[PDB]
Amino acid sequence: IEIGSYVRYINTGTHGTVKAIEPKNDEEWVLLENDIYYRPELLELVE
Amino acid sequence: RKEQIVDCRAVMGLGEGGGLAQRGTFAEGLRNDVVVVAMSPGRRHITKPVCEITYGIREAGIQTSVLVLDAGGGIPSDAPQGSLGSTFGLKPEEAKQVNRHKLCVIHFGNVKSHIIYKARLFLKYVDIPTIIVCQTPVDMEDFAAIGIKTKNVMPLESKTEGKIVEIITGVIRGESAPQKKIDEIIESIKKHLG
Amino acid sequence: ISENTNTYVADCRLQTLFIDEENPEDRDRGTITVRNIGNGVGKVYIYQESRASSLS
Amino acid sequence: MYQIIRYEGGVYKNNILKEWIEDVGGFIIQEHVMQLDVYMTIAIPQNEIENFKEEAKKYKGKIVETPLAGIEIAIVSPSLSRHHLPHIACDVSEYVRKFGAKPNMIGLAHGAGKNISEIREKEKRLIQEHDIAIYVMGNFESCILDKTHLFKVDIPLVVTGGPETLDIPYTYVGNLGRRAQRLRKGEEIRALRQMIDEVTKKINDKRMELSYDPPIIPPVVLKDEIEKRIDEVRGILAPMPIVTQLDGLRIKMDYDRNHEEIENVKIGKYLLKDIAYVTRSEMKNYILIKLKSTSE
Amino acid sequence: VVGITEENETVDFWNKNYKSFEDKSLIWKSISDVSFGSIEIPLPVSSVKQNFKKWDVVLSVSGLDTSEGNLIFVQRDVLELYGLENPKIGILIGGKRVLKTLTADDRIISI
Amino acid sequence: LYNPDIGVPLGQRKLMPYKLSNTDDYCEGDDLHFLNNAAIQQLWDDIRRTVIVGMDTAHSVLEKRLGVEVTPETINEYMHTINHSLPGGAVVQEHMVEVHPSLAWDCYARIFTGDDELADELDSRFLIDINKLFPEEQAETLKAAIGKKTYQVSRVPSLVGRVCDGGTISRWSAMQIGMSFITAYKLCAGEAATADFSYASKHADVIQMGNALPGRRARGPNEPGGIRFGILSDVVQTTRVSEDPVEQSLEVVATGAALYDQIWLGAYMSGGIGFTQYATASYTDDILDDFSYYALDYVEKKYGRMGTKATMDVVEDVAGEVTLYALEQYDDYPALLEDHFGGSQRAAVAAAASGIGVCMATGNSNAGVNGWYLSQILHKEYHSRLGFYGYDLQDQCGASNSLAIRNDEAAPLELRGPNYPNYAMNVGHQGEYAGIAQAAHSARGDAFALNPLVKVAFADPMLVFDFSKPRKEIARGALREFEAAGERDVILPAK
Amino acid sequence: NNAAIQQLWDDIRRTVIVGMDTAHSVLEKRLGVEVTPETINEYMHTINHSLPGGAVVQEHMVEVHPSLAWDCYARIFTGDDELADELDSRFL
Amino acid sequence: AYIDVECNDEAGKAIYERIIQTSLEDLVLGKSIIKAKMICKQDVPYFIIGILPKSKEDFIDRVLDFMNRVFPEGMRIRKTIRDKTIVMVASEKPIEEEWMNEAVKLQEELKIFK
Ligand code: F43
Ligand SMILES: C[C@@H](OP(=O)(O)O)[C@H](NC(=O)/C=C/CCCCSSCCS(=O)(=O)O)C(=O)O
C-alpha cells in the first residue's frame, strides 16, 4: 500500500487510488481519491 | 443481579388498544448506561423490535432508558433536495437526555439513503458512541461518505461529533427480534461500553 | 365588571396597553392586580379569594 | 380545595386557557403536546370547577376526572426481563398513568423464583417512599403463597396474580398473571379496572387519614412555590421534575448539592425546613420532602 | 377520631346504632384488641372472616350472638380471628393514644 | 431562533388504534390491510369458492333416461360419495393419485331443499337446515321463494382458488359432481346421459357468485368485479340473527367495503398500498353508525319505516337532512374531522348515511342511490370540496343515471355491480352502494335481497368465515386469532 | 400436493418486464431532469423498497408486512455494457 | 401446533397455554412443530416442555429460544435431551433423576404421537 496504488474496499468494492497516509491517534489511516479515510486492515492491494 | 428502577413516562399511551409509549417522551433508567431510541411509539417500532432490545439489555444487567423521538419518521431537511413525506429531527432536550448516557442504541429501517442522513443529523448533536440496528445490509462506510465519524471508516472532514460504533443488520420493524440478534447487540454493547 | 368568576372580577377597559413591571406577591382577599403579560395585558383584577402569587 | 383533573384539547388558543387558569389561581401540574393536541393535568380550586368546565367547552376541550392524579405508585415486578416487563407490567403502569398517577417500575434484584426470592432493605425503603405499591406476581397459587415475605412494607398494597382468588392476608386481584400479549381482552380489562378500584379505595382512605390532621401547606401549592423560587427546576431532564405525592413532594435534583437551598425556601412566613422533612432519597440521590401536620 | 372507610354493611349499622353504643364500657383489651359495649348487633354473623389492619374501627360480634356485638377497636394487625360478614367499618387514626390508654373502667359516654 | 433541524411531528392520529364499529376490539391500521388480515382473505376465499348447483334436472335425467330410481337413500349415498370426491378422492378409474386431505379440510358438499318431507329423511350431516338456521317467518319466506327444489352447495378447497383463479371453481364442482353421479348410481362411465349431467351442472342449473367479464375488463367468473350488490347483500347473514335494519345495512356496508374497495379496487385494479383507509372509514368508528341511526330516527319520526312511497320530495328531504347533520357533526367535533381527514372518506360516509335513510323511508334502492348523489353534490357546496379529483365522476352522472331507463345506464341497484359502467373505476362508492341496496330490504323486513339460494348457502355453519358478524371476524383477523384455510404446511419443509 | 409445481406457476405469473428507455428520454428532455447511473441506482433502491408493500417516507400509510413478501424483487438488465457495469450489482 | 398443559392449577393451565401459543407465534414456529406439551409441577419447582418437530441447527436454536421464552424466569437450571424430540427440564434446584425420567417418558410419548 502506497500513494498511487490501486485498492478496493472489501465490504463494497469501491475502487480508488491512495492519496495519502495520515496517521492519527496512534492508528494508521488511508486516504483514497474520494477524500474518505479507510483502514489498512479493511483494504488490500489489487493489480 | 441488582435492583433496576425505571422512571416511567409521565404521560399515558396511545388510546385503549394501542401502544403503551407516547411520542416525544423519555423514561430514565436511573443509572444511565444505555438509551434505546425509538423513531415512534407505533407498532413498527415499539415492543416489537425496541422493548425486546430493552429487555435483552436489562437481562444482561445493564440499566436501560427508552426515548421515543418526537419526530423520528422521515429524512432530515439537510438531505439532498430536502426532505419528502416527513421531516426528521432531534430536539435539544432530547439531545441532552441522550448525551447523559454512556452509549446509545438506535433502531433504523430499510432504505439506506434514509438511514445515512438520519444518522448524520442524529450524531450532529449526540456525542456518545451509538449502535445502529437496521434491517437492510448497510456497510460501515456509506456513513463516512457523507461525513459521519465511524470506528472503521473515518471521514476526512467529519460533520458529526458522534461515532457510529457498530451496525447490526437483520432486525425487521414490527417483528420479534430473535435471540441471536439480541445476543449480538448485547455483546457489542458490552465490548464497546466497559 | 367585564369578567366575573368565583375568585375575581376583572376590568377590560385597557386590555391592549403594555406595562413592564413585576410585583409578584400574594393575591389576598381584596387585592388589586394588573395583568402585565399575555392576551389580557392591562386588565385590572380585584380578588375575592386568597390565592397564591403570580408572575403575570 | 384544589381538585386535580386532566384537560385534553388542542394547542390552538391553549395559551389563553393557561392564562385563565393562572388568573383563577390554578396550577398546571403536567403539560404535553403530542402533535396538535395538548394534555394538561391542572389543579384548580373547587369553587371554579364549573367555570373551568364552561371554559373548556368553549375551546372544544375535554375534562377527564382523574382520581389518582396526586400520587405516585410503585409497580413492583420480580424482574425487568422479558417475562414481566414488556407485557403486564407496562400494562399495569400505563393503566395507572391513565388515571393521573405517576408510576415507577421497581424490578427486584432477586424477585424471581419460588424459594430463592428475596427483597433487599434498599428496595424495601425505595418502595416505602411511594404512596402505594402494586405487585405483579405470577400465575401459580402455590408459588404466590410461598412468596408472602415479598409483600412486607407498611404501604397500601394491591397484589395481582394469575389465580382468580388467593388466600394471602392482603388485597388481591385475580386474572392478571404473567402473560406475553398486550392486555386487550374484556376479562383482562375488567381485572385492570378492579385493580384500579382497589388502589382508588386505599388512596381515598389514606386521604381521609390525612384530612384528619391536614398538612400546613398542600403539596401542589408547595410545588408551585418551589418552581417559582428555585430556578434550577427547569433544567431537570427527568420525566417528572417534581412529583406530587399524597403528603409531600419528590424533587429530582441532587441532594448533596441542593438540600440547603431547598430547605431555605420561605413559604408564607415559615421556612421550609420548619414545616417539612427534607431528606435524601434512595431514588438516584434525589430530594424527598415530607410535609408536617398542623399538630406540629 | 374514628373514620368510616369500607362501606360493606356495618357502617349502615353504625349510622344510627352508634348512639345505641353511647355510654358503653370497655369490654376487654386482650390480644383481640380493645372492644367496647356491648349492645345488640343484628347484622348476620358469618363464620367467614376477613383480615383487618392496625388501628381500624371494627364492629365485630364477639361470640356470634346478635345481642353481644362489641365495638371492637382494633389496635394490632389482626388476621383471621373474628366472625361476622365483614366487621370492617372504619379506621382509627386521630386520638390513637386515647384508644390505647383506654381501660376497662373507662367508657366512651357521649359519641 | 429558527432551527431547521427540529423537524415536524406527523401522524399522531394514525398511531392510535382503530376501534371496530359495533364491537369492542381495538386494532392497528396496519392489521386492517387486506394482505395483513387473514379474515378478509378468508372472506374473499369463501365467497370465491362457492357454487350452487340445482340437482333436479340431473335427477330427472336419472329417472326418465337411465331408468334409475332416485330416493332419499340414494341421495344420502350420493352425498357421501361427493363429500369424498369433491376434495379430490378417487371413485373410478383404477390407479389414481389423490390430493392430501389436510389441504382440503375446508371442502364441503352441502345439500338444502325447500321440500320439508325430503329434508326430513336426509342425513343431517350434509343438510343445510333452513328451519333450524332461520326464524319461522324468514324460513317460510325462503322456502316459498325456493320451492320444492333440491340444491347442492359445493365449496371447493380454498387452495384451489389460491393456486388458480376464480373461474376454476365451477368447472371443479362440475367434474366432481359428474364423477359422483356416475359412481353413486352405478352408471356407465361415459354416455349421452353423462353429457346431460355435465351440461346441467356446468351451466343449466349452476349459480355463480360472479359473472364473467369478457372483453376490456378481461376476467373470469367468480371474481369480485362480477358480484352484484344484491348478491353480496344476500351473502351477509345478519338479517337472520338481528332485527335492527341499520345494523344489517352497516354489516353489509362493512363487507362491501372490505371486498370491493379493498380487494377488488386496491388490488385487482390497482396495487401496492391499496385503499385501506378509504374502506375502514365506513366500519372502524361509529361515525357511520351514528349518522345512520340519526337517519333512521329522523325517518321514523316524520315518515316511518315504510310510511311513504318513493317520490322526489322525500328523497330531497331525507338526503338533505342527513347530509346537513353529518357535516355539522364533522364541524362540531374535531376528533371526527381528524379521523376522516381525507375528503373522500367524509363524502362517502355522509352519502352512505343519506342513502340508507332514503332507503329506510321508501324501501327503494334506486331512491337510495339518488339520495346518495344528492348528498354528494350538497357536500360539495357545503365544504367547497368533495374528494380526490377523479372521485366524483360517477357522482356527477349519478343523478341522471340513477333512475335512467337507457340500456347502458339502467339497472336496479341490486342488479348493479363493479362492472356497472359508471362504478367501474373509483374507490369509496361500491361498498356503500351494497349497503344501500341491503337497506332497501331491511326497511321491509325481507328475508333476502336478490337470491334466496345464496342466502341459504351462506347460512351454512361450516363456512370458515362467519358472515353473521363480518366486523367481528375482521377484528379477530386483525388480532391474529382467526384460523384461515388454504394453507399448505403439510407439503412444505420445516422452517 | 407438490409445492414445486405451484411455485413454477407462481414465478411465471408474478413476472412483468418493463422497458425504461422512453421514461429516461421523457425525464431528460420533457421534464428537464438529468438521468445518470447514480439516479438509476436510486430509483432501483426506491422500487425495491416500494414494490412489495412499502410506502416511501410516509409512516402514516398502511404497509404490507415485510416478511409476507420476502420473494418480491425488482431487477434491471441492459444490453448497454458500460451502463451495465456502472449499475449496482445488488439488483442487476 | 398442538398445545396441552398438565397442571393442577386452573388459572396456570390457561395462562401458560396462552403463553406457549404466543411464544410459538412470535418465533413463527407453529407450522414447523407437531406437538408442544408442558408439564407444570409448582409444588416441587420444575417444569418440562417437550417439542415434536415436523418431519438444521437454526431450527434447534429457534426451539431453545422458545424454551427460554416459555419457561418461568426463576427456573434457571436447565438441561435438554435431543433425539429428534427436544425435551428440557427447568428448575431452581439441581436436576434430580426422577425429573429426567419424567422427561424421557414425555419424549417417548411425544415420539409415538400421531
Ligand atoms: C402523497 C400523494 C402523492 C400522489 O401521487 N398520491 C398521494 C400518495 C398516494 C399513494 C400513497 C403511497 C405512497 O408511497 O405515496 C397511494 C396508495 C396511491 C394508490 N396506489 O392508491 C394513495 N395515495 Ni393519496 N391516499 C389517501 C388519501 C389522500 C388524501 C389526503 C388528504 C389530506 O389532506 O391529508 C389526498 C387526496 C385529496 O387531496 O383529496 C391524497 C393525496 C396524495 N396521495 C398525494 C398528495 C401530494 C401530491 O400532491 O403529490 N391522498 C386519503 O384521503 C385517505 C386514503 C388514502 C389512500 C390509502 C389508504 O386508503 O389507506 C392513499 C392512496
Ligand atoms: C384501472 C384504472 O383505470 P384508469 O386509470 O385507466 O382510469 C382505475 N384507476 C383510476 O381511475 C384512477 C386511479 C387513481 C387512484 C385513486 C386516487 S386515491 S389518492 C390520489 C388523489 S389525486 O391526487 O390523484 O387526485 C381503477 O379502476 O383503479
Half-sphere exposure of E33 (CA within 13 A, CB side): 27
**Is the CB of residue F9 less than 8 Å from the CB of residue B71?**
yes
Residue of D nearest to E80 (CA): D169
**Is the CB of residue B118 less than 8 Å from the CB of residue B76?**
yes
Cis ω for the linkage preceding H55 (within 30 of 0): no
**Is the CB of residue F369 less than 8 Å from the CB of residue F394?**
no
Phi, psi of F19 (to 5 degrees): -65, 165
Q: What is the C-alpha to C-alpha distance for residues F237 and F251, in angstroms, rounded to an integer?
A: 9
* Beta-carbon separation of A36 and B141 below 8 A: yes
Q: Does B111 touch chain G (CB under 8 A)?
A: yes
Cβ neighbours of H58 (radius 10 Å): 10
For a mutational test of ligand 1's pocket, the pick from F260, F278, F391, i.e. the residue with the most ligand atoms closer than 8 A to its C-beta, is F278
Alpha-carbon separation of residue B136 from B76, B139, G46, G65 (angstroms): 19, 10, 13, 15
Q: What is the C-alpha to C-alpha distance for residues F124 and F120, in angstroms, rounded to an integer?
A: 9
Residues of F assigned a catalytic role: 93, 278, 390, 426
Phi, psi of B155 (to 5 degrees): -95, 155
Sequence letter at residue H73: E
Q: What is the C-alpha to C-alpha distance for residues E99 and E93, in angstroms, rounded to an integer?
A: 10
Task: Write out the DSSP string of chain B.
Answer: ---EEEE--SS--SSSSS-S--TTEEE--SS-SEEEEES-SSTTTTTTTHHHHHHHHHHHT--EEEEE-TT-SSEETTSTT--BSBEE---HHHHHHHHTSSEEEEE--S-HHHHHHHHHHHHTT--S-EEEEESS---TTHHHHTT--BSSS-BSS---SS-EEEEEE---TTSPPPHHHHHHHHHHHHHHH-
* Beta-carbon separation of B176 and H61 below 8 A: no
CA-based nearest distance D213→chain E, Å: 8
B49 contacts on G by Cβ (under 8 Å): none
- Triad A16, A21, A25: Cα angle to 5°: 130
Element (H, E) at H52: strand H46-53
Q: Which of F12, F334, F479 lies closest to D35 in CB terms?
A: F12
CA-based nearest distance F339→chain B, Å: 14
**Is the CB of residue B124 less than 8 Å from the CB of residue F5?**
yes
Helix (H, G, I), strand (E, B) or coil at F129: coil
Helix (H, G, I), strand (E, B) or coil at F394: helix
Q: What is the C-alpha to C-alpha distance for residues H66 and H25, in angstroms, rounded to an integer?
A: 10
Alpha-carbon separation of residue H21 from D180, F145, H71, H72 (angstroms): 10, 47, 13, 15
Q: Is F91 annotated for ligand binding? A: yes
Distance F260 CA to ligand 2 centre (A): 15
**CB crowding H7-21: b at 16 or more within 10 Å, else e:** bebebbbbbbbbbbb
Sequence letter at residue F368: G
Q: What is the C-alpha to C-alpha distance for residues F360 and F442, in angstroms, rounded to an integer?
A: 8
**Is the CB of residue F473 less than 8 Å from the CB of residue H35?**
no
* Size of chain F in residues: 495
Q: Which residues contact F69 (CB under 8 A, 6 or more apart)?
A: F63
Q: Does D64 touch chain B (CB under 8 A)?
A: no
Q: What is the C-alpha to C-alpha distance for residues B3 and F389, in angstroms, rounded to an integer?
A: 60
Closest CA to F295 of F355, F374, F378: F355
Helix (H, G, I), strand (E, B) or coil at F419: coil
Q: Are strands H2-6 and H33-41 parallel, antiparallel or unpaired?
A: parallel
Task: Write out the DSSP string of G50-73.
Answer: HTTT--TT-TTS----GGGGTT--
Q: Does E79 touch chain D (CB under 8 A)?
A: yes
Half-sphere exposure of H28 (CA within 13 A, CB side): 10
DSSP type of residue D6: E
DSSP type of residue F16: S
Q: Are strands C32-34 and C44-47 parallel, antiparallel or unpaired?
A: antiparallel
Q: What is the C-alpha to C-alpha distance for residues A2 and A24, in angstroms, rounded to an integer?
A: 17
DSSP type of residue H94: P
Q: Is the dihedral of CA A24, A27, A30, A36 positive or negative?
A: negative
Q: What is the C-alpha to C-alpha distance for residues B87 and B73, in angstroms, rounded to an integer?
A: 7
**Which cell numbers hold the place of H64?**
431453545
Distance F388 CA to ligand 2 centre (A): 9
Ramachandran region, residue B147 (left: φ > 0; alpha: ψ -120 to 50; beta: rest):
left
**Is the CB of residue C8 less than 8 Å from the CB of residue D24?**
yes
**Which cell numbers hold the place of F297?**
330516527
Q: What is the C-alpha to C-alpha distance for residues F101 and F490, in angstroms, rounded to an integer?
A: 10
Ramachandran region, residue C30 (left: φ > 0; alpha: ψ -120 to 50; beta: rest):
left
Element (H, E) at A44: strand A43-45
What's the reported resolution, in angstroms, to a tenth? 2.8
Phi, psi of C20 (to 5 degrees): -125, 80
- Triad H13, F479, F19: Cα angle to 5°: 125
**Is the CB of residue H109 less than 8 Å from the CB of residue D133?**
no
Ramachandran region, residue F185 (left: φ > 0; alpha: ψ -120 to 50; beta: rest):
alpha
Q: What is the C-alpha to C-alpha distance for residues F469 and F62, in angstroms, rounded to an integer?
A: 41
Counting Cβ atoms within 10 Å, is residue D65 exposed (0-12), middle (13-18) or buried (19+)?
exposed
CA-based nearest distance H26→chain B, Å: 6
Closest CA to E108 of E19, E16, E6, E4: E19
Distance F347 CA to ligand 2 centre (A): 17
**Is the CB of residue F150 less than 8 Å from the CB of residue F476?**
no
Q: Is F79 annotated for ligand binding? A: no
Distance linking the first and last C-alpha atoms of chain H: 12
Helix (H, G, I), strand (E, B) or coil at G24: helix
Q: What is the C-alpha to C-alpha distance for residues F296 and F353, in angstroms, rounded to an integer?
A: 9
Q: What is the C-alpha to C-alpha distance for residues F89 and F107, in angstroms, rounded to an integer?
A: 12
Sequence letter at residue B87: T
**Which cell numbers hold the place of F77?**
349415498
For a mutational test of ligand 1's pocket, the pick from F34, F388, F427, i.e. the residue with the most ligand atoms closer than 8 A to its C-beta, is F388
Element (H, E) at F484: none
Closest CA to D84 of D146, D135, D128: D135
**Is the CB of residue F413 less than 8 Å from the CB of residue F365?**
yes
Task: Write out the DSSP string of F220-242.
Answer: -SSSGGG--HHHHHHH--GGGT-
Closest CA to C15 of C37, C38, C41: C41
**Which cell numbers hold the place of F207?**
349459480
Alpha-carbon separation of residue D55 from B160, C49, D31, D44, D62 (angstroms): 48, 20, 18, 13, 10
Task: Write out the DSSP string of D229-291.
Answer: H-SSGGG--SSSSEEE-SSEEEE-S-HHHHHHHHHT-EETTEEGGGTEEEEE-TTTT-EEEEE
**Is the CB of residue F400 less than 8 Å from the CB of residue F355?**
no
Q: What is the C-alpha to C-alpha distance for residues F440 and F237, in angstroms, rounded to an integer?
A: 16
Alpha-carbon separation of residue D285 from D108, D222, D235, D248, D259 (angstroms): 19, 21, 17, 17, 11
DSSP type of residue F17: P
Cβ neighbours of G52 (radius 10 Å): 19
**Which cell numbers hold the place of D27?**
396550577
Q: Which of G42, G54, G66 lies closest to B172 in CB terms?
A: G66
Q: What is the C-alpha to C-alpha distance for residues F365 and F371, in angstroms, rounded to an integer?
A: 10
Q: What is the C-alpha to C-alpha distance for residues H32 and H35, in angstroms, rounded to an integer?
A: 10
Query: How many whole angstroms from its chain centre is CA F493?
Result: 36
**Which cell numbers hold the place of G17?**
418486464
Give a three-class secondary structure readout of D65-110. CCCCCCCEEEEEECCCCCCCHHHHHHHHHHHHHCCCCEEEEEECCC
CA dihedral B71, B73, B78, B80 (to 10 degrees): -170
Closest CA to E6 of E56, E73, E72: E56
Phi, psi of G40 (to 5 degrees): -65, -40
Using the structure block, give the residue that is written with the C-alpha cell 394469575.
Answer: D162
Bridge partners of E36, per DSSP, are E26, E71
Closest CA to F185 of F92, F103, F116: F92
Alpha-carbon separation of residue D219 from D154, D245, H107 (angstroms): 22, 7, 62
Q: How was this structure determined?
A: cryo-EM
Alpha-carbon separation of residue F479 from D64, G62, H16, H32 (angstroms): 29, 16, 19, 21
- Triad G16, G22, G23: Cα angle to 5°: 75
**Is the CB of residue B188 less than 8 Å from the CB of residue B63?**
no
H61 contacts on B by Cβ (under 8 Å): 179-180
Q: What is the C-alpha to C-alpha distance for residues F289 and F278, in angstroms, rounded to an integer?
A: 16
**Which cell numbers hold the place of D88?**
403486564
Closest CA to F44 of F282, F286, F226: F226
Q: What is the C-alpha to C-alpha distance for residues B118 and B125, in angstroms, rounded to an integer?
A: 12
Sequence letter at residue D234: R
Alpha-carbon separation of residue B92 from B21, B29, B99, B108, E65 (angstroms): 21, 20, 10, 21, 72
Using the structure block, give the residue that is written with the C-alpha cell 367467614.
Answer: E48
**Is the CB of residue D166 less than 8 Å from the CB of residue H42?**
no
Counting Cβ atoms within 10 Å, is residue D34 exposed (0-12), middle (13-18) or buried (19+)?
buried
CA dihedral D112, D115, D119, D121 (to 10 degrees): -150
Helix (H, G, I), strand (E, B) or coil at E8: coil
Can you state the angle between helices B179-193 and B50-60, rounded to 10 degrees? 60
Counting Cβ atoms within 10 Å, is residue F454 exposed (0-12), middle (13-18) or buried (19+)?
buried
Over the Cα atoms of chain B, what is R_g? 16
Cβ neighbours of F31 (radius 10 Å): 21
Q: Which of C7, C35, C54 lies closest to D45 in CB terms?
A: C7
Query: Counting ligands in written order, which one lies closest to the CA of residue F277?
Result: 1
**Is the CB of residue H34 less than 8 Å from the CB of residue H113?**
yes
Cβ neighbours of F190 (radius 10 Å): 10
Q: Which residues contact E7 (CB under 8 A, 6 or more apart)?
A: none
Bridge partners of E69, per DSSP, are E61
Q: What is the C-alpha to C-alpha distance for residues H9 and D124, in angstroms, rounded to an integer?
A: 30
Q: Which residues contact D151 (CB under 8 A, 6 or more apart)?
A: D135, D157, D159, D168, D170
Ramachandran region, residue F425 (left: φ > 0; alpha: ψ -120 to 50; beta: rest):
alpha
Counting Cβ atoms within 10 Å, is residue C55 exposed (0-12), middle (13-18) or buried (19+)?
exposed
**Which cell numbers hold the place of H108?**
417417548
Chains touching chain B, criterion 3+ CB pairs below 8 Å = A, D, F, G, H
Q: Are strands F108-113 and H2-6 parallel, antiparallel or unpaired?
A: unpaired
Q: What is the C-alpha to C-alpha distance for residues F164 and F157, in angstroms, rounded to an integer?
A: 11
**Which cell numbers hold the place of F253?**
356496508
CA dihedral F135, F138, F139, F141 (to 10 degrees): 160
Sequence letter at residue H75: M
Q: Are strands D37-45 and D27-33 parallel, antiparallel or unpaired?
A: antiparallel
CA-based nearest distance F398→chain G, Å: 31
* Size of chain C in residues: 56
Sequence letter at residue F35: L
**Is the CB of residue B171 less than 8 Å from the CB of residue B107?**
yes
DSSP type of residue D293: B
Cβ neighbours of F155 (radius 10 Å): 25
**Is the CB of residue B26 less than 8 Å from the CB of residue B97?**
yes
Can you state the angle between helices F287-302 and F245-256, rounded to 10 degrees? 140
